[PDB]
């Protein structure tokens, strides 16, 4: 997966999306839909779907929602206040946590100002807490801005890594785009019928 402070961003495009294989997979620990309840996804069409991916702690999945606060939603990944998509999350302790501590999953814990929604910040400047110029060196009130989850397999739930995917359906002003599949039927040759082609 991708870090939490530099999430990924895949722009799903024109295709045939089947959110039912997602919705009923029962492997997801969290499947919340906000703009639109889940069962009506396979019956609507938008312009673009974006999918963002990252990895967080177990008990920070409640900050991936419109209108929250905390070190994740403040400055790592902010969701607008009229979100439309759905948020999916599942535990991944066996893949991402390794004995001795997996120190490759970082997050940002200091920033000047909270993020704008869907804004991204991969800089690595020394956070200047004190008026004293940091000059680019560490010290009191001059802190490196990135910390690392040290994940370990013997962690209580709520400290084990969860993988998160945020689908965001957007509708600019194009002519059309991706929509859900559509079943059909057979042919009843010789039988006054009510049809839709």
């Amino acid at each position, epitope marked *: 997966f991708a870090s939490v402070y530099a999430w990924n961003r895949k722009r799903i495009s024109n295709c045939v999306a089947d959110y039912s294989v997602l919705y009923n997979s029962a492997s997801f620990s969290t499947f919340k839909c906000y703009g639109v309840s889940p069962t009506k996804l396979n019956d609507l069409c938008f312009t673009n779907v974006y999918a963002d991916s990252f990895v967080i702690r177990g008990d920070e999945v409640r900050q991936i929602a419109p209108g929250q606060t905390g070190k994740i939603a403040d400055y790592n990944y902010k969701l607008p206040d009229d979100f439309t998509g759905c948020v999916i999350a599942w535990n991944s302790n066996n893949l991402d946590s390794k004995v001795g501590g997996n120190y490759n999953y970082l997050y940002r*814990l*200091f*920033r000047k100002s909270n993020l704008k929604p869907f804004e991204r910040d991969i800089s690595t400047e020394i956070y*200047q*807490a*004190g*008026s*004293t110029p940091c000059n680019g060196v*560490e*010290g*009191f*009130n001059c*802190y*490196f801005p990135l*910390q*690392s*989850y*040290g994940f370990q397999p013997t962690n209580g739930v709520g400290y084990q890594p969860y993988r998160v995917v945020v689908l965001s359906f957007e509708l600019l002003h194009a002519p059309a785009t991706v929509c859900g599949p559509k079943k059909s039927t057979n042919l009843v040759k010789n039988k006054c019928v009510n049809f839709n082609f």
Partner: antibody
Amino acid sequence: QVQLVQSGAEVKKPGASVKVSCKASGYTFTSYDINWVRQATGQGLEWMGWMNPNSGNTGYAQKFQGRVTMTRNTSISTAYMELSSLRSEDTAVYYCARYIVVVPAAKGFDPWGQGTLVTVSS
Amino acid sequence: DIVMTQSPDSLAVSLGERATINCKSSQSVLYSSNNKNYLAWYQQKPGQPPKLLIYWASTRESGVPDRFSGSGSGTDFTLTISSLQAEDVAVYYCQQYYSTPLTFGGGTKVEIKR
């Protein structure tokens, strides 16, 4: 949880050396600077902050220099302190604290060690 | 350099009173628009490690009831606990921040009536 565990309430003879430990828990460890203070019998405190999560250059209080050495281990996040050439008036109690920070500027020390005892005298 | 001289000492006054502990040296307003302050208040029970009280000088008490209440300015300030009650008998130090070391000294006891 947010804790600090010290150990080593002990007695030394003058002209010797001592190592003191502070065990941490409930945090990422390498993310908040450890700061130790002295405290005599019914007096004030001192010892400026120093040391950092990663590597950390470490500082000092400029009247304690040379005798002071700060060593830690990334095996569990346990900061220590090595004092040397004791002069039988440095007998005091010694503390630990996490010095927590928050967006703007850190606000005082997060936790507070349980303290320890060093008694120097022949 | 910056000496935190605290004037009052042993304010052994009847509970509920309103102590006023002053100290100052060599301002630490700290630029960067963060015009707040730079020094916490502390409480150390006798035979105990210290604890944390008002910080930023900005009343910012944490798990701490309202009677303990700070104030602040550029150089001078005060803790000013209100409606003091039994078990607030401690020693109350100050801070310095970007400075280097610390400095402070204060406490109370009782007074009685007879």
